[PDB]
Amino acid sequence: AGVASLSAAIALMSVGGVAQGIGSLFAALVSGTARNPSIKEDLFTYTLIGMGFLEFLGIICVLMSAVLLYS
Amino acid sequence: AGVASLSAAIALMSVGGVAQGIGSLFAALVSGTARNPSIKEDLFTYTLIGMGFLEFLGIICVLMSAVLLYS
Amino acid sequence: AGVASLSAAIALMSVGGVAQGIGSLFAALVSGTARNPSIKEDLFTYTLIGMGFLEFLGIICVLMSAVLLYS
Amino acid sequence: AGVASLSAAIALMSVGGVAQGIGSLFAALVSGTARNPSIKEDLFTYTLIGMGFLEFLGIICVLMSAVLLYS
């Protein structure tokens, strides 16, 4: 039943689409901070909202892997 | 039935695009907020609306997996 | 000459991303230099930090590749 | 001994997805310094937060590859 250990990796291949998202997000945060520093407190806040979803997606890509590895 | 696991993994190998889309969204939000803070209260609304689609897509990209895993 | 070779070759599909990351780094460096030469040796410093991870990651792949070719 | 290797080599593609994203992060940091050197710090910290999250993702992918190699 080695196919399970394959489905797991085929699921973890997604994380490469999450990391790029986070990277572009924080790139925009930084760059925006290089124009209007006086409002970082808001930028970060909004930024977190974004991550507050991205990580969740990532978690799935991991969680389901385990599922596809045992169940 | 070890193939269902493979298919459920595959169907879950597309949230990467969802994440890159969310990253684009919140990056442009943050930027457009750097150039004009006074209008944040709108730049947020529209952002949410966008997610109101991606999330849906995401749910599908998750939901169907479970289906393809049992059925 | 079996499947381990296939795995050690698949493990060199990541080098693409590493190279693209390095390209982005040094492109941003060249740009931020053409835009502000006075701080070249500052930019460079930060640039190097990035390599400390990318190069590293890349190497891991290669190493792990051999780990699979001579399991 | 013939499937696990494939699973591991397949989980080591998230790395090329990550290096992209780290490259963009540090590129944005560089250009941000090029635009406003008065603040190199207050960027390095946000950059470091993003890079911590991305390094975590890389650790996940590598670790799970090693798992599926020994399981």
């Binding site: 080695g2 394959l6 | 193939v3 493979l6 | 499947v3 | -």
Partner: peptide
């Protein structure tokens, strides 16, 4: 299974 290294695993 001419592709013994690969075919054997799934759909044999």
């Amino acid at each position: 299974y001419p592709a013994s290294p690969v075919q054997e695993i799934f759909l044999p």
